[PDB]
Structure formats: structure tokens, C-alpha cells
């Protein structure tokens, strides 16, 4: 007959006459309790797709599939097929190569509320995401410290608002502003900077912190970000794309940014005044893991 196990109220039969220890031995999952194999929701589902076990009741599959979510499941499977030892709990998916410290994966959903604070007090090493076509995406977020290699100087100039735009003299740091008939077309931020209003707003505070680091800040609107930043002198394209994370945030925004960024081969940086300081956090797609 078929040796069988159980996944919480769900009895299944091991296919092709395989010992319970075969499974345990081969997939490093589950355990024995009496003459039954005890599989957790994931493992059970996992093996079910492996064609390794059948179900007593028809509902079971669906039930367990609902129990664990598609998102969380796909993650489980991938990490599993890749080779890791997986284990979910506390609302996180832990995986290790074998005996080293595990790694926390955090399955996300476009409409989940994301916060900068979370990105800095990061309890998880990765953020996972599966799209509408079952395609997975892993991300990573770490506090960064932009290093501009540009000669910085204090710029306190006179600003004039005319025609609905702000302007300054045509000599300020060659890079600050734009050339317009001997004048210099300013951005609302650039105006506040040489105007001496660094505390105007949070985006202003970051703007200054940024320039002060040796970076050159130009508007990053053509990307949906507050600004683009060049780290070096002769920089053909801006390495960083920085955006100030507003009051409430939705993940797709984060997700979105990372895309329009990698596309233009730049890096998404999220700034915010965390604990009285202007810190930055880089978010990027992660390969290897999955």
C-alpha cells in the first residue's frame, strides 16, 4: 500500500511506493510522528507539485494553497529548488546554504505601506516580490553615504523671481542652474540653496546635505525622482537617482523607482531625515538569491 503522512488535518499518500524516510532523506523536510509523515503547509504543497504525493480529499490542495499564499509559496519553492534549506515563521522566510546564519526574506505586495524607518531598522536582508506572471524579484536596501568628488564652495547669491521662474546671476557654480540669455535659470531647490533657505523643506535639507558631500545636484524629474546626482567631475551620466520618501509610502513606488532607475543604469536612493540626520538608503534588484 501507499505510506502516508499528514499536514495538519490533511492526509496525503506518498507516490510510487516511497518510504517516508526517502522524502525526509531526499528533500530534507518533515518528520515522523507515529506511522505518519508530518509535513508543514509549504512542504506538503511543495511535494505535491513534485508529483511525489497524492491527497485523500480533493479540497486539501486548494485549502493548503489558500493557507499559504501564492506569493509566499512561490518564494518557498524557488529558494527550495535553488538548494537552500527554507523555513517560514514570524511572517518571514528564512533560508541558509546549510548551517550558516539564515537570511530573512520579506514577501511584499505593491499596496503594502512602506516606511523609511523600516528600511533602516531593517530586520530582513531581502524583500521579495512576485508579479502577475509569477515572475519573482528580490531587492536589498542598505544605508548609503554618497561620496561626491567635487570641489565644494559656499554659494550665497541674489535671486530674482520673474516670468514665473527663479533666476540668479550667470556665474554661480557652472553646474548650478541653466544658461538663459546671460542669466541662470534656477529650480525651486537651487533657488532656496544659494538663497540661504536650507531649512525650507526636507527635500531642501537633503539637497544641501547632498551638494555639501561633493555631489552635483540636478533635477531628476525625467525619472520621477526629486533629483539626479553626479558623483564625479567628468561624469557622463548621473550615477544616483535620489528621492525623498514622503509621509506615507506604497511599495510599488519603491518597486517603480528601482525599475526606471536600473533601466537608465542609475541607482535608487531614498533619503529622509532619520533621527535628526539626513541619511540615505540604496535599494536594488538582487540576483544570486533566486
Swiss-Prot record:
Lineage top rank: taxon: Archaea
UniProt keyword list: Lyase, tRNA processing
GO annotation, cellular component aspect: cytoplasm
GO molecular function: lyase activity; nucleic acid binding; tRNA-intron endonuclease activity
Active-site residues per Swiss-Prot or TrEMBL entry: 230, 237, 266
One Gene Ontology term from the biological process aspect of the record: tRNA splicing, via endonucleolytic cleavage and ligation
Listed InterPro entries: tRNA_endonuc-like_dom_sf (IPR011856), tRNA_intron_Endo_cat-like_sf (IPR036167), tRNA_intron_Endonuc_cat-like (IPR006677), tRNA_intron_Endonuc_N_sf (IPR036740), tRNA_splic (IPR006676), tRNA_splic_arch_long (IPR023516)
Reaction(s) this enzyme catalyzes, per UniProt: pretRNA = a 3'-half-tRNA molecule with a 5'-OH end + a 5'-half-tRNA molecule with a 2',3'-cyclic phosphate end + an intron with a 2',3'-cyclic phosphate and a 5'-hydroxyl terminus
EC class name: lyase
Entry EC number(s): 4.6.1.16
Coiled-coil annotated residue ranges, if any: none
Record family assignment: Belongs to the tRNA-intron endonuclease family. Archaeal long subfamily.
General function of this protein: Endonuclease that removes tRNA introns. Cleaves pre-tRNA at the 5'- and 3'-splice sites to release the intron. The products are an intron and two tRNA half-molecules bearing 2',3' cyclic phosphate and 5'-OH termini. Recognizes a pseudosymmetric substrate in which 2 bulged loops of 3 bases are separated by a stem of 4 bp.
Assembly: Homodimer.
Protein's name according to its UniProt entry: tRNA-splicing endonuclease
Organism, scientific name: Thermoplasma acidophilum (strain ATCC 25905 / DSM 1728 / JCM 9062 / NBRC 15155 / AMRC-C165)
Gene name of this polypeptide: endA
